[PDB]
Ligand binder design. Structure first.
Ligand code: BCB
Ligand code: BCB
Ligand code: BCB
Ligand SMILES: C/C=C1/c2cc3[nH]c4c(c3C)C(=O)[C@H](C(=O)OC)c4c3nc(cc4[nH]c(cc(n2)[C@@H]1C)c(C(C)=O)c4C)[C@@H](C)[C@@H]3CCC(=O)OC/C=C(/C)CCC[C@H](C)CCC[C@H](C)CCCC(C)C
Ligand SMILES: C/C=C1/c2cc3[nH]c4c(c3C)C(=O)[C@H](C(=O)OC)c4c3nc(cc4[nH]c(cc(n2)[C@@H]1C)c(C(C)=O)c4C)[C@@H](C)[C@@H]3CCC(=O)OC/C=C(\C)CCC[C@H](C)CCC[C@H](C)CCCC(C)C
Ligand SMILES: CC(C)=CCC/C(C)=C/CC/C(C)=C/CC/C(C)=C/CC/C(C)=C/CC/C(C)=C/CC/C(C)=C/CC1=C(C)C(=O)c2ccccc2C1=O
Ligand code: HEC
Ligand code: HEC
Ligand code: HEC
Ligand code: HEC
Ligand SMILES: CC(C)=CCC/C(C)=C/C=C/C(C)=C/C=C/C(C)=C/C=C\C=C(C)\C=C\C=C(/C)CC/C=C(/C)CCCC(C)C
Ligand SMILES: CCCCCCCCCCCC[N+](C)(C)[O-]
Ligand SMILES: CCCCCCCCCCCC[N+](C)(C)[O-]
Ligand SMILES: CCCCCCCCCCCC[N+](C)(C)[O-]
Ligand SMILES: [Fe+3]
Lengths: 323, 258, 273, 332
């Protein structure tokens, strides 16, 4: 076995490299330190950190959002610090419970929720241009930023675009561990079972394929570490036996293959498609489909099954039944 | 009336369903699968003789070429004409088109099968600021072994047949990633140095086990042009040598495990 | 037929069983003994699918469903129309998957590369066994396993989940979902990074490993490095099932209540009750 | 942490849909033993003499009965409601017609209520019926009742910790969670759905596309309604010791026909019956009860699914006394 794929046997230390960016080279802060155990499964060097305007903008807005959430959570346990730790996962900040439509809700019923939402959104925008601008300062493509943009767009969809399109803030995702989880069933129940939403299926298809691809890709590169396949940039510009063998492994297995560069396009596209497909689904939900199961029945897609115990007429539609 | 309803049993979501499938297959078929063809294409046959004009499918499956402008001068354009010049000492086991080839000589030296190397550039991979990236510790003197790990310099190398085959004289490090990639070792009884990729190295505290090749086979490990640097092709030549051993070092390794 | 660089690798040997007898290609496909068993099991499998489907109501691919037996048949053979087909097809699937994996080790040996990929492919084969074999063994009927239908298998995931009131609270599930999400993220980041270095665009020049690590250090203060991101990727992906398996096996054999209630171990500690 | 195998499973849907009950034998055995404490029927007495309407002085509900029949009823009522307290819980020792003690008047309406249950709600209690024991389980205060706010513990026979006490506000989220099978759902399904008939529990549309006129802005029910009925269903599932699959094929929660089981229909009638009982029998009893029985808003204790079922899909595993005590219903 090649033990180098499991962990680094002999770590190396050496002077810290700094690649100069078109700007902000002075805004890198902290002194690098090295971790020996980290260095067995990774790169040992932790830090420094770039610290631009946007990074701080993000921390500013995010902490505002986190504080708005935490104080509302604490208010839910009338500020008892011990019950706060005990009940933390059950505590949340909820959108309006009553129907105000698009009206700005009272603070005690989703106003605070709305404001945490604004400040998180601003934090995501700030972090986004950090992710983008860092790439141009170092003279790199904006690939990551576009993938990240899709992720942010999906959050906006479940957070406020979908509430806007149906016209009720009551449909936002709550903040909280279990509470954000509870929303998923409430939403799915309201809209007729998300298993019958094709864009759910697409999202899952790509999400699972990200599992398939990264397991497959990660395993492939490790299988060709002896020939240097981890040095992927120079294997793009000067094909070595590593990617030759990697390509022939797959070609002989599934009948076709990629290049060392294009597999990364595959992976980038699949991860992007998780969020693009999820977004289309939410945009269509509520606005143009009310019950995803009935929509599948309408179009002849739903499976059907014989009764096991006897079919049961809705009692509410028998004559003279109470309401 | 219904939000999303259109004329005669159409609705918006039904159209988007069709649109989405179209978008997917467009990206997969017209874009990704062509990107997949930037290497190894056009394919080769029992001599495709039509030398006057190209066959239509070979033009359609390829993307428009792209050019990488390399960081230390140069450009590379893919896809391109890149045929294998070298004489491969292999022979056809049969007439069938996809029958395997047998090695005619000694497959480690002759560099076939798992011992094949790509015809990469005969240039030394460089750091971001121009220096040779993969250098041994005699040159990279500001690089050390980390506090806690075996220092292999001095330790013996034991090959697959339990025979001491040489002594580790040095480690070659990746100055761009801070990562040791080869050990240098003296080959006992032949007064030469040889590089081993660490991936073929079982690093113990008293020895370095190497199961890929036999002790005698350390004689014909490819030699470098220079003492203190290595080219990308040489790295392929060296790495491939041991990988060949996994299948060829003994007669019994090619035949069925059961 | 052959990639420009292919012919030098296309040598004999590296098989696990059969030596020269099945050591050859057909088009691009390596065969081997496990190629032959794969095709056998595939043929048998999709034959049994097609027979079973014709004895059913519809031919609409979305609505076909080959289902396991009733629970009353426990772990015995069931009549072919009422679970036998499902039993036969499951065996053919396992034959095909294991063949496929072993085919991959043979291909790995011939190229003189690591067996990491067939290794990685074991974990989805394992997870399939958790759902169709081990968990039905522990509960005592094949009828607890899932049906073979594009949409019908979702109805099983659905009801299975709701048998425990809110499956989201399943801690094995929480772990599994978290790996699914972060794995998808990391692949975006990894693929994004690689292309951003090789494709800055505007005629600008290709960058370098140092640029790779510099980018992540700058934005999040750490960069795990080239080789390690691949090791981490395989680790993250694999733990989607490796941890989720526990949450699946627990549900039923080791837990019959709803999954939210399980968190009583925390909520109901007397010291803060 | 965990419960050891094996698990008893049942089937409630077509093979392959993973619908049924998943029960822990230990737990079922414990609940079976607890419910087996149901006292056996008293021996039958033969009807002799005049109706008790002409012998005793203050009998308005049970006047049809003869003296031996009537007294048999009274010792059964004592066995079911006040075994440890005895006849004197409802009576003055020296005036059996005195209504001076509040349990007397409540017991009178409880008689009318449980007779009503066994006559008007046969769609839910069927031939099994209910007796006083079904709810009371041998104490004057039934172990499982509800106020207009959630209380802990669910069994009022257990003593509350400081946080569990309703006046401790830091423990609201936990009081609420334990009513909804430990979910963080932020709704009290009892006051929303079981205390009265003001709210509809159905929330999911019965058309594929959104109907213009009910689908935008303030025309829309808020999403909270979906959370709320999820909560009610969690709470129902817990109260019967079962899961959604007992009543639903989750493929379409909103569908009946092949997508529902007969138990879902019975559960539907149970909602209606619990609303009748609360609105028309139990809630008005705040006039007749002492303040120590009322909640923090002057409300009497009311009933939910648990009051009868106590974690079993049939109360007391289907035990019945109906034919043994005709006086308790049904009445022609
Ligand atoms: C414990 C939970 C499970 C689950 C939960 C689940 C959900 C919630 C959803 C799916 C979905 C899917 N699942 Mg399912 N599933 C599937 C296959 C499928 C596909 C129909 C679809 C998308 C798959 C995908 O893109 O993956 C990534 C793999 C890729 C991208 C490579 C291509 C795969 C190719 C599309 C597979 C197609 C398979 C064929 C239709 C079946 C084989 C046909 C035979 C005759 C050769 C198989 C083959 C198995 C096996 C053998 O175990 C399986 C088990 C499970 N699924 C478990 C039961 N799955 C989605 C769907 O849309 O279903 C309607 C969906 O929403
Ligand atoms: C009972 C209810 C269910 C449900 C309800 C549900 C809903 C309502 C929605 C989904 C969605 C999705 N579901 Mg689904 N689901 C899925 C899988 C999935 C996902 C692939 C997909 C997209 C969500 C995502 O990846 O977000 C992970 C990524 C996120 C959330 C982006 C985060 C990026 C962000 C920039 C991160 C930044 C955070 C900050 C750093 C922190 C700051 C916060 C502080 C300040 C407070 C599987 C595999 C199954 C199975 C096996 O059963 C399943 C079953 C269910 N789902 C049941 C049917 N699911 C979504 C979808 O696709 O709908 C069409 C969706 O909207
Ligand atoms: C209402 C019910 C729900 C539910 C019920 C549920 C159950 C009951 C189980 C899961 C499981 C899982 N759920 Mg979950 N779920 C998930 C995500 C997930 C997955 C991460 C995880 C594993 C799925 C699996 O086992 O694949 C199985 C995939 C397999 C077996 C792949 C087989 C591949 C095979 C080897 C090869 C097949 C090859 C083809 C046939 C060949 C054909 C190809 C062609 C091209 C030739 C998300 C992200 C969400 C969201 C967003 O809400 C969600 C909500 C729900 N889940 C709802 C709450 N979920 C599983 C789990 O791990 O639980 C802890 C599980 O058992
Ligand atoms: C399929 C597509 C996937 C995807 C894709 C992508 N996702 C990306 C990118 C792409 C392309 C980025 O480039 C960007 C990034 O930067 O990566 C390094 C990023 C992000 N995705 C995060 C979280 C996430 N992605 C999720 C999901 C998906 N994403 C889906 C699955 C989920 C789920 C599943 O819920 C979560 C929770 C954050 C780490 C980050 C934003 C931080 C922020 O918006 O500021 C918010 C401001 C704060 C103050 C919060 C501080 C705490 C957080 C943890 C941040 C701490 C970092 C800090 C620098 C630590 C320093 C310590 C140091 C000294 C040692
Ligand atoms: C965490 C681990 C991840 C992971 C990892 C890896 N995944 C790998 C590898 C690794 C490493 C490979 O090396 C291998 C491969 O070669 O890559 C191209 C592979 C593969 N992953 C496939 C499917 C896949 N991966 C999934 C998931 C994950 N993978 C998770 C995420 C999922 C889902 C559902 O998520 C699917 C559907 C095939 C494409 C391929 C097997 C081909 C095969 O096996 O050929 C042999 C079999 C056939 C050609 C068909 C056989 C038909 C049978 C006999 C009859 C049908 C019965 C069937 C049960 C009916 C079901 C009906 C259905 C509607 C319910
Ligand atoms: C007819 C007959 C008797 C034949 C005998 C021979 C025989 C056994 C034939 C088998 C026939 C069969 C069953 C064929 C089916 C083939 C199968 C299973 C195809 C499935 C293909 C699918 C859907 C794959 C999903 C994954 C996916 C999206 C891949 C796209 C990108 C690719 C090709 C990734 C593979 C790949 C990865 C993962 C790298 O990391 C890598 C690194 C460097 C260079 C190349 C690569 C590379 O190609
Ligand atoms: C409350 C739960 C009671 C217990 C315990 C006992 N009795 Fe009772 N009794 C109760 C009520 C509400 C009534 C009125 C019945 C009606 O139909 O309106 C009665 C009535 C009697 C009578 C009739 C006397 C009269 O009103 O003239 C008798 C003789 C009587 N009860 C006796 C009795 C005995 C012996 C008991 C212990 C075995 C007993 N009762 C318990 C309410 C309750
Ligand atoms: C559930 C549907 C019940 C049935 C059947 C019967 N009772 Fe009941 N009772 C029930 C509740 C929810 C309450 C309120 C809690 C309380 O303690 O008041 C009661 C109350 C009584 C009382 C008053 C006891 C007291 O407050 O100390 C009595 C005397 C009583 N109930 C008697 C009684 C009898 C005799 C019944 C059968 C004829 C009977 N109850 C049925 C719930 C339910
Ligand atoms: C039987 C004892 C049930 C169990 C267990 C669960 N549900 Fe239920 N549900 C039941 C009934 C009788 C009704 C109709 C109530 C009425 O008054 O009309 C419902 C309703 C729902 C709904 C709403 C469907 C609609 O038409 O809007 C949902 C979404 C629902 N139920 C979900 C659900 C879940 C998730 C359960 C397990 C937690 C569950 N139910 C259990 C009866 C019974
Ligand atoms: C006492 C007045 C009850 C209350 C309050 C509720 N239920 Fe009930 N239920 C009761 C009886 C006596 C029976 C008879 C058992 C039999 O053999 O039929 C039932 C039955 C059910 C069932 C049927 C279960 C089965 O296995 O067939 C269900 C699903 C049910 N009850 C549900 C239910 C719900 C959801 C309730 C609160 C709304 C509820 N019941 C209250 C007595 C009483
Ligand atoms: C016109 C104006 C007024 C209105 C528009 C405002 C606007 C754009 C609102 C947008 C709102 C949006 C996008 C809302 C989306 C909310 C979502 C998706 C919430 C989802 C999950 C929230 C979770 C998990 C939060 C949990 C909170 C906590 C754990 C406490 C906070 C503390 C932390 C340390 C956070 C850690 C989170 C995690 C990494 C562990
Ligand atoms: C995961 C859910 C997938 C459901 C697939 C249903 C697609 C319905 C669209 C079918 C095409 C329209 N038409 C005309 C054929 O009915
Ligand atoms: C449900 C998600 C859909 C994902 C689609 C990914 C399918 C990849 C198909 C590979 C096609 C191979 N080939 C050679 C035929 O082009
Ligand atoms: C229409 C749905 C199709 C789902 C995606 C199927 C993936 C196709 C892979 C089969 C191609 C095999 N081949 C020819 C490339 O060897
Ligand atoms: Fe990579």
């Amino acid at each position: 076995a090649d033990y180098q794929t499991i962990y680094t046997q002999i770590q190396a230390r050496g002077p810290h490299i700094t690649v100069s960016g078109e700007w902000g080279d002075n805004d890198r802060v902290g002194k690098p330190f090295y971790s020996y155990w980290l260095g067995k499964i990774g790169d040992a060097q932790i830090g420094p950190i770039y610290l631009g305007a946007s990074g701080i903008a993000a921390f500013a807005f995010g902490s505002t959002a986190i504080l708005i959430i935490l104080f509302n959570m604490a208010a839910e346990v009338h500020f008892d610090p011990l019950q706060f730790f005990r009940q933390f996962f059950w505590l949340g900040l909820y959108p309006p419970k009553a129907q105000y439509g698009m009206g700005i809700p009272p603070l005690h019923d989703g106003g605070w929720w709305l404001m945490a939402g604004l400040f998180m959104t601003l934090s995501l925008g700030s972090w986004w241009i950090r992710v983008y601008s860092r790439a141009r300062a170092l003279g790199l493509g904006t690939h990551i930023a576009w993938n990240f943009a899709a992720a942010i767009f999906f959050v906006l969809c479940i957070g406020c675009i979908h509430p806007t399109l149906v016209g009720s803030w009551s449909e936002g995702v709550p903040f909280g561990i279990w509470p954000h989880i509870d929303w998923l069933t409430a939403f799915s129940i309201r809209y007729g079972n998300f298993y019958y939403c094709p864009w759910h299926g697409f999202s899952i298809g790509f999400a699972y394929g990200c599992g398939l691809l990264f397991a497959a890709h990660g395993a492939t590169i490790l299988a060709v570490a002896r020939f240097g396949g981890d040095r992927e940039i120079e294997q793009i510009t000067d094909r070595g036996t590593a990617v030759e063998r990697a390509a022939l492994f797959w070609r002989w297995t599934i009948g076709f293959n990629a290049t060392i560069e294009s597999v990364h396009r595959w992976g980038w596209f699949f991860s992007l498609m998780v969020m693009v497909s999820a977004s289309v689904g939410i945009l269509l939900t509520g606005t143009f489909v009310d019950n995803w199961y009935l929509w599948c029945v309408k179009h002849g897609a739903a499976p059907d099954y014989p009764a096991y115990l006897p079919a049961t007429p809705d009692p509410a539609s028998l004559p003279g039944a109470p309401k | 009336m219904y939000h999303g309803a259109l004329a005669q049993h159409l609705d918006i979501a039904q159209l988007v369903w069709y649109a989405q499938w179209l978008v997917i297959w467009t990206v997969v078929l017209l874009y990704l699968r062509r990107e997949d063809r930037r290497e190894g294409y056009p394919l080769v046959e029992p001599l495709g003789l039509v030398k006057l004009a190209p066959e239509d499918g070979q033009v359609y499956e390829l993307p428009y070429p792209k050019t990488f402008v390399l960081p230390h001068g140069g450009t590379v354009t893919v896809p391109r004409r890149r045929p294998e010049t070298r004489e491969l000492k292999l022979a056809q086991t049969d007439g069938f088109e996809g029958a395997p080839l047998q090695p005619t000589g000694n497959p480690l030296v002759d560099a076939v099968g798992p011992a094949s190397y790509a015809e990469r550039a005969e240039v030394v991979d460089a750091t971001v600021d121009g220096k040779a990236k993969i250098v041994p510790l005699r040159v990279a003197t500001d690089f050390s072994i980390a506090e806690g790990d075996v220092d292999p310099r001095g330790l013996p190398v034991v090959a697959a047949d339990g025979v001491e085959a040489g002594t580790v004289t040095d480690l070659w490090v990746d100055r761009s990633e801070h990562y040791f990639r080869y050990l240098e070792l003296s080959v006992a009884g032949s007064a030469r140095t040889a590089l081993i990729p660490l991936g073929f190295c079982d690093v113990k505290k008293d020895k370095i086990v190497v199961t890929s090749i036999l002790s005698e086979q350390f004689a014909n490990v490819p030699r470098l042009q220079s003492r203190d640097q290595i080219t990308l092709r040489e790295e392929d030549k060296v790495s491939a040598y041991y990988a060949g051993g996994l299948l060829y070092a003994t007669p019994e390794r090619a035949e069925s495990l059961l | 037929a052959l990639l420009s660089f292919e012919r030098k690798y296309r040598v004999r040997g590296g098989t696990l069983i059969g030596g020269d007898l099945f050591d050859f290609w057909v088009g691009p496909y390596f065969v081997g003994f496990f190629g032959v068993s794969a095709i056998f099991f595939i043929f048998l499998g999709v034959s049994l699918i097609g027979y079973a489907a014709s004895q059913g109501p519809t031919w609409d691919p979305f609505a076909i469903s080959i289902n396991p037996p009733d629970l009353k048949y426990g772990l015995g053979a069931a009549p072919l129309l009422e679970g036998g087909f499902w039993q036969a097809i499951t065996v053919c699937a396992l034959g095909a998957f294991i063949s496929w994996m072993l085919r991959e080790v043979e291909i790995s040996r011939k190229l003189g590369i690591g067996w990491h990929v067939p290794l990685a492919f074991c974990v989805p084969i394992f997870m399939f066994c958790v759902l169709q074999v081990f968990r039905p063994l522990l509960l005592g009927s094949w009828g607890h396993a899932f049906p073979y239908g594009i949409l019908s298998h979702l109805d099983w995931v659905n009801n299975f989940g709701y048998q425990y009131l809110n499956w989201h609270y399943n801690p094995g599930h929480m772990s599994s979902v978290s790996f699914l999400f972060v794995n998808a993220m990391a692949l975006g980041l990894h693929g994004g990074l690689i292309l951003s270095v090789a494709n800055p665009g505007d005629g600008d020049k290709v960058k370098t490993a140092e640029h790779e690590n510099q980018y992540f250090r700058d934005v999040v203060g750490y960069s795990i490095g080239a080789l390690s991101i691949h090791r981490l990727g395989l680790f993250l992906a694999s733990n989607i099932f490796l941890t989720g398996a526990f949450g699946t096996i627990a549900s039923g054999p080791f837990w019959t209540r709803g999954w939210p209630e399980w968190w009583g171990w925390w909520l109901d500690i007397p010291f803060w009750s | 942490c965990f419960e050891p195998p094996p698990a008893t499973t049942t089937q409630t849907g077509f093979r392959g849909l993973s619908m049924g009950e998943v029960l822990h034998p230990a737990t079922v055995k414990a609940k079976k033993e607890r419910d087996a404490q149901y006292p056996p029927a008293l021996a039958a007495v033969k009807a002799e003499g005049p109706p008790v309407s002409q012998v005793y002085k203050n009998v308005k509900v049970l006047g049809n009965l003869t003296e031996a029949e009537f007294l048999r009823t009274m010792t059964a009522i004592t066995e079911w409601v006040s075994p440890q307290e005895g006849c004197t819980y409802c009576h003055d020792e020296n005036n059996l017609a005195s209504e001076a003690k509040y349990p007397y008047v409540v017991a009178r309406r409880m008689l009318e209520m449980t007779r009503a249950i066994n006559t008007n709600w046969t769609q839910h209690v069927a031939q099994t019926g209910v007796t006083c024991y079904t709810c009371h389980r041998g104490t004057p205060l039934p172990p499982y009742v509800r106020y207009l706010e959630p209380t802990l513990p669910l069994n009022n026979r257990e003593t509350p910790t400081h946080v569990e006490r309703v006046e401790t506000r830091s423990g609201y989220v936990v009081r609420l969670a334990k009513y909804t099978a430990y979910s963080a759902l932020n709704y009290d399904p009892f006051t929303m759905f079981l205390a009265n008939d003001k709210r509809q529990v159905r929330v999911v549309p019965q058309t594929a596309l959104p109907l213009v006129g009910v689908s935008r802005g303030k025309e829309r029910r808020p999403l909270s309604d979906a959370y709320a009925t999820f909560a009610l269903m969690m709470s129902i599932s817990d109260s019967l010791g079962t899961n959604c699959t007992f009543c639903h094929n989750a493929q379409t929660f909103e569908s009946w026909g092949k997508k529902s089981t007969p138990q879902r229909a019975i559960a539907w009638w149970g909602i209606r019956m619990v609303r009748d009982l609360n609105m028309n029998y139990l809630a008005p009893l705040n006039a007749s009860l002492p303040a120590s029985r009322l909640g923090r808003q002057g409300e009497a204790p009311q009933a939910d699914c648990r009051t009868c079922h106590q974690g079993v899909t049939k109360p007391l595993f289907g035990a019945s006394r109906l034919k043994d005590y005709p006086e308790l219903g049904p009445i022609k």
